[PDB]
Scaffold this active site. Sequence first.
Site, mmCIF file in Angstrom:
data_model
loop_
_atom_site.group_PDB
_atom_site.id
_atom_site.type_symbol
_atom_site.label_atom_id
_atom_site.label_comp_id
_atom_site.label_asym_id
_atom_site.label_seq_id
_atom_site.Cartn_x
_atom_site.Cartn_y
_atom_site.Cartn_z
ATOM 1 N N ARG A 152 -2.102 -43.396 75.999
ATOM 2 C CA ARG A 152 -2.970 -42.861 77.021
ATOM 3 C C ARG A 152 -4.040 -41.898 76.414
ATOM 4 N NH1 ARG A 152 -1.936 -37.950 80.993
ATOM 5 N NH2 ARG A 152 -3.808 -38.165 82.337
ATOM 6 N N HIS A 187 -8.009 -42.586 76.850
ATOM 7 C CA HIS A 187 -8.856 -41.557 77.451
ATOM 8 C C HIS A 187 -9.884 -41.005 76.468
ATOM 9 C CE1 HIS A 187 -6.960 -40.488 81.449
ATOM 10 N NE2 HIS A 187 -6.552 -41.695 81.107
ATOM 11 N N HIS A 193 -0.027 -50.418 80.322
ATOM 12 C CA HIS A 193 0.922 -49.768 81.250
ATOM 13 C C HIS A 193 2.305 -50.353 81.129
ATOM 14 C CE1 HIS A 193 -2.702 -48.254 83.539
ATOM 15 N NE2 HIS A 193 -2.319 -47.382 82.540
ATOM 16 N N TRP A 247 5.936 -48.484 85.284
ATOM 17 C CA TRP A 247 5.628 -49.836 85.707
ATOM 18 C C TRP A 247 6.753 -50.791 85.441
ATOM 19 C CZ3 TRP A 247 1.911 -46.352 84.046
ATOM 20 C CH2 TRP A 247 0.740 -46.272 84.836
ATOM 21 N N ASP A 286 -3.951 -52.181 89.948
ATOM 22 C CA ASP A 286 -3.138 -53.316 89.465
ATOM 23 C C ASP A 286 -3.210 -54.508 90.439
ATOM 24 O OD1 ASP A 286 -2.249 -51.870 87.322
ATOM 25 O OD2 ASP A 286 -0.546 -51.045 88.498
HETATM 26 C C1 HEM Z 1 -7.360 -50.327 83.945
HETATM 27 C C2 HEM Z 1 -7.736 -49.088 84.297
HETATM 28 C C3 HEM Z 1 -6.694 -48.040 84.254
HETATM 29 C C4 HEM Z 1 -6.258 -47.203 85.263
HETATM 30 C C5 HEM Z 1 -6.733 -47.119 86.711
HETATM 31 C C6 HEM Z 1 -5.224 -46.418 84.684
HETATM 32 C C7 HEM Z 1 -4.547 -45.421 85.392
HETATM 33 C C8 HEM Z 1 -3.482 -44.688 84.896
HETATM 34 C C9 HEM Z 1 -2.816 -43.667 85.616
HETATM 35 C C10 HEM Z 1 -3.206 -43.202 87.011
HETATM 36 C C11 HEM Z 1 -1.789 -43.241 84.827
HETATM 37 C C12 HEM Z 1 -0.765 -42.167 85.128
HETATM 38 C C13 HEM Z 1 -1.074 -40.826 84.429
HETATM 39 C C14 HEM Z 1 0.033 -39.852 84.800
HETATM 40 O O1 HEM Z 1 0.199 -39.502 86.008
HETATM 41 O O2 HEM Z 1 0.805 -39.436 83.882
HETATM 42 C C15 HEM Z 1 -1.847 -43.997 83.617
HETATM 43 C C16 HEM Z 1 -0.929 -43.922 82.586
HETATM 44 C C17 HEM Z 1 -1.066 -44.621 81.403
HETATM 45 N N1 HEM Z 1 -2.127 -45.361 81.009
HETATM 46 FE FE1 HEM Z 1 -3.554 -45.985 82.140
HETATM 47 N N2 HEM Z 1 -5.072 -46.716 83.389
HETATM 48 C C18 HEM Z 1 -5.871 -47.720 83.054
HETATM 49 C C19 HEM Z 1 -6.036 -48.286 81.799
HETATM 50 C C20 HEM Z 1 -5.323 -47.995 80.640
HETATM 51 C C21 HEM Z 1 -5.567 -48.525 79.354
HETATM 52 C C22 HEM Z 1 -6.721 -49.426 78.982
HETATM 53 C C23 HEM Z 1 -4.561 -48.062 78.522
HETATM 54 C C24 HEM Z 1 -4.430 -48.319 77.078
HETATM 55 C C25 HEM Z 1 -4.126 -49.513 76.580
HETATM 56 C C26 HEM Z 1 -3.707 -47.227 79.320
HETATM 57 C C27 HEM Z 1 -2.539 -46.630 78.916
HETATM 58 C C28 HEM Z 1 -1.782 -45.827 79.781
HETATM 59 C C29 HEM Z 1 -0.477 -45.296 79.352
HETATM 60 C C30 HEM Z 1 0.204 -45.542 78.025
HETATM 61 C C31 HEM Z 1 -0.022 -44.534 80.364
HETATM 62 C C32 HEM Z 1 1.287 -43.773 80.409
HETATM 63 C C33 HEM Z 1 1.226 -42.305 80.055
HETATM 64 C C34 HEM Z 1 2.609 -41.673 80.077
HETATM 65 O O3 HEM Z 1 3.700 -42.306 80.117
HETATM 66 O O4 HEM Z 1 2.633 -40.423 80.069
HETATM 67 N N3 HEM Z 1 -4.219 -47.202 80.587
HETATM 68 N N4 HEM Z 1 -2.908 -44.862 83.671
#
Ligand code: HEM
Length: 247
Positions: A36, A40, A161, A177, A206
């Site tokens: 993440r 970001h 995710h 997820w 999603d």
């Molecule tokens: C497609 C558009 C995307 C949206 C709307 C989105 C949205 C989110 C949101 C809302 C979270 C939760 C953050 C939290 O409350 O801790 C999250 C977590 C995450 N996102 Fe995304 N995301 C997207 C794309 C991506 C991409 C491209 C990656 C990298 C390949 C990514 C990797 C992650 C990971 C690894 C987490 C987990 C963080 C954790 O476990 O603390 N995301 N994302």
Amino acid sequence: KSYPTVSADYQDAVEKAKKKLRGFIAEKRCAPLMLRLAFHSAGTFDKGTKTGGPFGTIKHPAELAHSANNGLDIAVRLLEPLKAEFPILSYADFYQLAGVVAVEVTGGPKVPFHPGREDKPEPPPEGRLPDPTKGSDHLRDVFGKAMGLTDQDIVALSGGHTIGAAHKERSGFEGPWTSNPLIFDNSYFTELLSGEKEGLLQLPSDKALLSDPVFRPLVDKYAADEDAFFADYAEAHQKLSELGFAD
Ligand code: HEM
């Protein structure tokens, strides 16, 4: 892409930092947070203006204060003593390297990594990262128009995710997820296809994949063929990690 030359000392630092990052991320159980962090860092790229993207700026308090970045302070502070062991590396490379390692140590494809990104002084404006309450048009404005990634990239990258969870104090969403949120696999897609489920998260963004005529064939292909997901995933994460870099 034309990748820059870095010194042998720089290359040795990359290799040694990759190894240290593996043991660190594995023992700390923080691969999702680090992935993440890398997204970001990179996802703020705007091709129109050539601003944002994976240039070390995510450590700046101004960027940490973006509400999309809630909790990334923890990621940044967790890495600081390890980063201090590799003062030659830019923050830009270091955080992308942590992203690549996060995928690898959780059992994902190996994403090719090329060093040399420079740390920029200027964080991008807030508001460029995807909004989980929106749909396909929006993802295309964010990934296609600003970033310059493809529809195939969008779907493969949503596969990120497959590891990790949302946190109500961070995004406000809550939960994993997948049943195996430390294992990099195609479960994100199989879960999406089997619809809503107790204790697994799905976002509105999603759902937007399931009803788009271009995204849905890709969700089906990844749910059915993990190798195809791994290969498209590796390609998209490479492109993402390299936005604005070495063009
Ligand atoms: C497609 C558009 C995307 C949206 C709307 C989105 C949205 C989110 C949101 C809302 C979270 C939760 C953050 C939290 O409350 O801790 C999250 C977590 C995450 N996102 Fe995304 N995301 C997207 C794309 C991506 C991409 C491209 C990656 C990298 C390949 C990514 C990797 C992650 C990971 C690894 C987490 C987990 C963080 C954790 O476990 O603390 N995301 N994302």
